[PDB]
Design a protein around this ligand. Structure first.
Ligand SMILES: NS(=O)(=O)c1ccc(S(=O)(=O)Nc2cccc3c(Cl)c[nH]c23)cc1
Lengths: 355, 774, 79, 52
């Protein structure tokens, strides 16, 4: 195709849409050797969903400062906001950092940090994952006596997981204003509230930039689903084989689908019970965040013969189910993820940052 | 703090769709048309189409189909808006109380599907059981048509193809089988409403060729479907396969169809070149049963480029165009002197694509007289609309007009005609039809040196403002492409010049790499090129900036001084600038994805950071700047007068217009702003005060609880700013048709609405001057 | 241990491969080779474990098994 | 060929719209209400009521 004939089609047709205008090449391109500052340890994560802010982070103990930058083509990429991530947290590792946005509620971003292995002798049998939500700098503004200017705050919490759970940044952040965290002993949904409830009808660290407020005011609410209690309740009622069962060792939980409107999240649960012999299942449980748990599938019983490959075969089944049951989500209502593994393409704004 | 008032100086004229049936009663052949929000009901009678009503829906009507359930005497109506409001409406005529009674209404957005590429497809089961809707990819919205007490519990069925071209409910199968074409292969399915799922429908899936686009469900008794598109017209039903590939259907894609005989014996096919085909099905008995022998298509002639076709009685068809003029056309049973079984009867006028307009003063007296450009391929025409009511004189060009401007010195019009020619090995390439460029008095090709497609010949026509014939056609060179045009005086010259922005686009590359700015004069019968300048890139938009020419190349806005030696000279390079508006010293550059940008004399001033695709922008005053985007909206963003807070714009006024606005032009037909959309609508934006804005706002909130709507669509929902990312109520704009409809209600309804201000006749006063600017 | 896998169906992320290659042993890096201009997966991938025995166990554990629309193969000699 | 239909031979033989302003209200009979439940979860529920 062309671009000029595409413009004529737009003029006489009135259906200009970036869905059909997607396989068109991005225009503006830089090697990031002309607009970058410190002429630092600024590793550039990637653009926002809007296209104006660019994010970067500096490791430099390690420190991990996070930086929102305002963009400009002819003039400078001006640094707007610098924020300290995970204060009063003893950090030791390289920390693969992953930042994400909510689908619609774009007033705050969320960032997770995962290392390679824990150091509590460095325990190989643990992993430290950190989380913190931080507000985005409000561009349209209008001494904290003005209301719509104090859109800046912070909430961080560190946890350890035990064989390791799966990062899932499309379903954990599909419900707006709520984050889902698989703590490997529980599943926790955290909801923040600025000034009527997004909850039923771990302990956090909240901060503004450095201070520590009291729990335009902000309140948090967290709901927490414990795996052992729900496994015992689902076995005691929905188990066509559950009489030879005695105990259970290990389980992995994958999130299949999160319905925001019904406030329900589907969790596949790959259990290792004993019934005796080593036996595995693949349960399915629907969780209703508005009040409670409902069963969907209490599946079969199966003998294991490879160690650990039960989990990879099981997660192969989970991605087989989700890749079968996908509905292609829209632009706008999707979750963007920025992570640099150690080029930034804003395909909407057609900007290339080659490295 | 910015207040504007938008009113419709011309209701949209382009036909968005048409349906036929016994709607007003059981016995009267109603023809229903949807023009972009207006549902115009007609009764076929002896003198012709006697128009009954014009019911105005609050939405862009995208699905409009007539279905009759069992036990209903006459047809009900199902309308779906393009904002996913659905309604089922029953006519009721008691002497004069025409009451279009809504029966069903509700929102069918699901907010997590994505918009499918080909469009909304609404289909009704031929035994009235349920309604199928492809709104989103990978999903099928089914509404059961049950009459129990209140609900119609619609649900979804996960279609597993994620790219479906066209889907039809099929005929005569004992359970309702859909039949679709996915990206291509034809599949069927059989819907199970009791369990709400697809079942493997009978007549398993087959392959078709990749440009197939239309599925037609043939009625009883034939069963099965026809798949049409690009020399592939294939009937399929189970065992039965049938194909045909004539050379006639190759040239252009068939765009609509209509069923002539009620048992599917013959069909009507309209395509992009405006031709007309009669698709013929032949019967055979082989006994009892009835089968299809052999398909044949038969041409009928040429009509206007049809968006919807419709056969009406006694051999007349309603060619309901979207680009150009709609038609009632008689099908002659006899031939003609060239092989045309179609003869024209009534040419319903339509503006259609208002690509651009410059409001000029033809005679005198400062009364605005709009000269818009219109049409797409063979029905491009200059429409001259003046206030009366609105008389619209049509000058057909038979080729595409791109932009126009007015050179009042020689009393002439410069316009950009782009005709499509089809290549051959015979010579270079010879055109299709006799058009305006081919019928010129004196033409000249540009003489400056410097198989599956179609070439574009781009010309400047110069057109007299009194007689509107053509005077000279300047044809640009091979693979040249004129984009933008401006008429102005430059430098200290005494004479006015035409300035055209041509590019050289090539089939092998998407991005253009060379173009030239060419400057002509008109020496009273001769168009003489006085300047040319070869620029590396395409010349996208050109504007006069205080005797200097502010050009825009690919992303480089340059400025040109017009030197004394008749030559153009560059000044600077600031780095898709495609709209350039100039109020004195400011420049409002609207990038396609850069929202808006300002410039001064190039010291940048402010920008906007918002996901938009600017169809056009406008400089309202030096503070407020007004843009229309491709999500069918309007928004105004002021300039706040803190250096980061100085280099920023704030979107203060949001308004879901419902149109795709191709051009803004300053002026007034009777300052104000005309916007000329792509449904032919011409609209007016006026600035306001603060207290008048609050007056009209509170009057409108008291008016919305009284003037009931059709389909119960909320006026706070139809006008609320809705793009794909977010939704929010409308601020900073006043829907002028809601307030102009105040004066047409009854006097008890006039005195019932207010109750909380002085009197009521004063409102009758104030609205009666708001109409005096149309 | 170094490994190349290319079989993916233009909808596998770095995270899906991390989750299905993880629970054998400690993993150090996943680099799913995406095509740049489409913003979408090219269909390759270079994943490196920490140790050298879990990648070799993955060679016979996950080779040619159908992932969700197609037979995914694993394989490393030197790559 | 040409045996075209006729609903009425008097139609089109002897060959400006009004605007519908609604004031009075006759109430709405039925409401289109979309089912809330997700497709996979509804499918798994209806399969768990098929074998169980
Ligand atoms: N657009 S999609 O194809 O529907 C789609 C895309 C990404 C995601 S995700 O963020 O949840 N990643 C994810 C998906 C599936 C399995 C796993 C494992 Cl194991 C770890 N992460 C997984 C879900 C759905």
């Amino acid at each position: 195709e062309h671009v000029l004939k595409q413009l004529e089609r737009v003029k006489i047709s009135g259906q200009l849409s970036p869905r059909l205008f997607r396989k068109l090449p991005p225009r503006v391109c830089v090697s990031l050797k002309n607009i970058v500052d410190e002429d630092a340890g600024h590793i550039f994560l990637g653009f926002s969903k809007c296209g104006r802010y660019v994010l970067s982070y500096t490791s430099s103990f390690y420190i991990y400062h996070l930086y929102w930058w305002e963009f400009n083509v002819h003039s400078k990429l001006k640094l707007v906001r610098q924020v300290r991530l995970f204060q009063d947290e003893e950090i030791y590792s390289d920390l693969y950092l992953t930042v994400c946005e909510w689908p619609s509620d774009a007033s705050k971003v969320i960032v997770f940090g995962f290392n390679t292995r824990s150091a509590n002798m460095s325990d190989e049998n643990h992993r430290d994952i950190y989380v913190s939500t931080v507000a985005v700098p409000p561009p349209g503004r209008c001494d904290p006596n003005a209301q719509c200017l104090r859109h800046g705050f912070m909430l961080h919490t560190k946890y350890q997981v035990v064989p390791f759970p799966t990062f899932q940044p499309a379903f954990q952040l599909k419900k707006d204003q709520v984050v889902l965290l698989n703590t490997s002993y529980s599943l926790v949904a955290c909801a923040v509230s600025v000034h009527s409830f997004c909850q039923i009808l771990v302990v956090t660290d909240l901060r503004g930039r450095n201070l520590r407020p009291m729990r335009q005011y902000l309140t948090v609410e967290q709901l927490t689903l414990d795996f052992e209690y729900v496994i015992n309740e689902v076995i005691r009622h929905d188990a066509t084989w559950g009489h030879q069962f005695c105990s259970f060792s290990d389980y992995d939980i994958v999130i299949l689908e999160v319905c925001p409107e019904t406030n329900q999240v589907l969790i596949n649960i790959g259990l290792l019970l004993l019934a005796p012999k080593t036996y595995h299942t693949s349960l399915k449980v629907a969780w209703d965040l508005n009040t409670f748990e409902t069963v969907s599938v209490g599946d079969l019983t199966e003998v294991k013969q490879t160690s650990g490959s039960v989990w990879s075969s099981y997660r192969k089944s989970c991605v087989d189910m989700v890749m079968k049951w996908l509905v292609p989500e829209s632009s706008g209502r999707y979750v963007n993820r920025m992570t640099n593994e150690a080029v930034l393409a804003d395909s909407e704004r057609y900007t290339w940052i080659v490295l | 703090m910015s207040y504007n008032y938008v009113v419709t100086a011309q209701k949209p004229t382009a036909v968005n769709g048409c349906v036929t049936g016994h709607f007003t009663s059981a016995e009267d052949l109603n023809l229903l048309i949807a023009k972009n929000t207006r549902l115009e009901i007609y009764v076929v009678t002896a003198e012709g189409l006697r128009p009954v009503k014009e019911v105005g829906m609050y939405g862009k009507i995208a699905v409009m189909e007539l279905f009759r359930p069992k036990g209903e005497s006459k047809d009900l109506l199902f309308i779906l808006t393009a904002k996913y409001n659905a309604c089922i409406l029953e006519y009721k005529q008691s002497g004069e109380s025409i009451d279009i009674i809504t029966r069903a209404h509700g929102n069918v957005q699901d907010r997590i599907g994505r918009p499918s590429e080909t469009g909304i497809i609404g289909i009704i089961d031929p035994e009235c059981r349920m309604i199928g809707l492809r709104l989103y990819d990978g999903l099928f919205k089914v509404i059961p048509l049950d009459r129990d007490n209140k609900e119609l519990k619609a649900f979804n069925i996960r279609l597993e193809e994620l790219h479906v071209i066209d889907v039809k409910f099929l005929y005569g199968c004992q359970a309702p089988t859909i039949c679709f074409v996915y990206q291509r292969h034809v599949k069927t399915y059989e819907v199970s409403l009791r369990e709400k799922e697809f079942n493997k429908g009978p007549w398993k899936q087959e392959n078709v060729e990749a440009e197939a686009s239309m599925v037609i469900a043939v009625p009883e008794p034939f069963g099965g479907a026809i798949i049409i598109g690009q020399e592939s017209i294939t009937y399929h039903n189970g065992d039965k396969y049938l194909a045909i590939a004539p050379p006639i259907i190759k040239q252009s894609t068939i765009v609509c169809h209509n069923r002539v005989d009620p048992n599917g014996s013959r069909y009507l096919l309209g395509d992009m070149e405006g031709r007309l085909f009669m698709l013929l099905l032949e019967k055979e008995e082989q006994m009892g049963t009835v089968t299809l022998k052999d398909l044949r298509v038969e041409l009928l002639g040429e009509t206007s480029i049809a968006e919807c076709l419709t056969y009406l009685d006694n051999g007349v068809v309603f060619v309901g165009s979207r680009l150009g003029d709609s038609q009632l056309v008689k099908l002659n049973v006899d031939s003609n002197e060239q092989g045309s079984y179609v003869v024209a009867m009534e040419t319903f006028t339509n503006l259609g694509p208002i690509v651009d307009m410059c409001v000029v003063d033809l005679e005198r007296q400062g009364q605005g007289q709009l000269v818009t450009c219109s049409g797409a391929f063979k029905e491009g025409s200059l429409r001259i609309i003046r206030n009366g009511k609105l008389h619209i004189r049509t000058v057909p060009l038979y080729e595409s007009p791109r932009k126009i401007c007015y050179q009042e010195v020689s009393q002439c019009f410069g316009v950009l005609s782009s005709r499509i020619e089809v290549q051959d090995t015979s010579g270079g390439t010879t055109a299709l039809r006799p058009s305006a460029s081919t019928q010129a008095l004196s033409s000249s090709v540009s003489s400056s040196k410097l198989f599956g497609e179609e070439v574009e010949v781009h010309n400047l026509l110069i057109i007299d403002q009194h007689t509107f014939e053509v005077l000279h056609a300047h044809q640009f060179l091979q693979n040249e492409y004129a984009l933008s045009l401006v008429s102005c005086k430059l430098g200290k010259d005494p004479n006015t010049y035409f300035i055209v922005g041509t590019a050289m686009v090539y089939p092998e590359e998407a991005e253009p790499k060379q173009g030239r700015i060419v400057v002509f004069q008109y020496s009273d019968g001769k168009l003489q090129t006085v300047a040319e300048k070869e620029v590396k890139g395409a010349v996208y938009s050109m504007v006069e900036f205080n005797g200097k020419l502010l050009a825009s190349i690919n992303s480089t806005v340059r400025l040109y001084e017009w030197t004394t030696e008749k030559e153009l000279r560059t000044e600077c390079n600031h780095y898709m600038a495609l709209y350039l508006k100039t109020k004195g010293d400011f420049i409002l550059v609207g990038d396609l994805m850069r929202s808006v940008l300002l410039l001064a004399y190039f010291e940048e001033i402010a920008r906007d950071f918002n996901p938009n695709w600017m169809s056009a922008v406008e400089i309202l005053d030096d503070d407020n700047f007004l843009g229309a985007e491709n999500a069918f909206n309007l928004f105004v963003c002021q300039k706040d007068s803190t250096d980061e807070e100085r280099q920023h714009l704030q979107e203060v006024g949001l308004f879901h217009l419902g149109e795709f606005v191709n051009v803004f032009c300053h002026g007034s037909l009777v300052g104000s702003v005309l916007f000329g959309t792509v449904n032919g609508m011409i609209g007016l934006v006026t600035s306001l005060s603060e207290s008048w804005y609050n007056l009209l706002l509170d009057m409108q909130n008291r008016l919305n609880k009284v003037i009931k709507s059709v389909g119960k669509i909320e006026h706070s929902f139809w006008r609320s700013f809705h793009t794909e990312r977010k939704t929010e109520p409308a601020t900073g704009f006043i829907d002028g048709d809601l307030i102009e409809s105040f004066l047409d209600i009854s006097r008890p309804k006039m005195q019932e609405v207010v109750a909380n201000l002085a009197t009521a006749d004063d409102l009758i006063k104030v609205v009666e001057e708001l109409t005096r600017i149309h | 241990m170094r490994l190349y896998v290319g079989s993916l169906h233009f909808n596998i992320t770095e995270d899906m491969l991390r989750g299905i290659f993880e629970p054998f042993g400690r993993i150090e890096s996943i680099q799913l080779m995406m095509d740049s201009e489409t913003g979408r997966s090219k269909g390759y991938g270079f994943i490196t474990f920490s140790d050298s025995e879990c990648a070799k166990k993955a060679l016979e554990q996950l080779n040619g098994f159908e992932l969700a629309g197609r037979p995914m193969k694993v394989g490393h000699v030197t790559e | 060929l040409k045996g075209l239909p006729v609903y009425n031979k008097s139609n089109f033989s002897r060959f400006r719209p009004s605007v519908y302003l609604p004031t009075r209200e006759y109430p709405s009979e039925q409401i289109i209400v979309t089912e809330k439940t997700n497709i996979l979860l509804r499918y798994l529920h209806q399969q768990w009521d098929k074998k169980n």
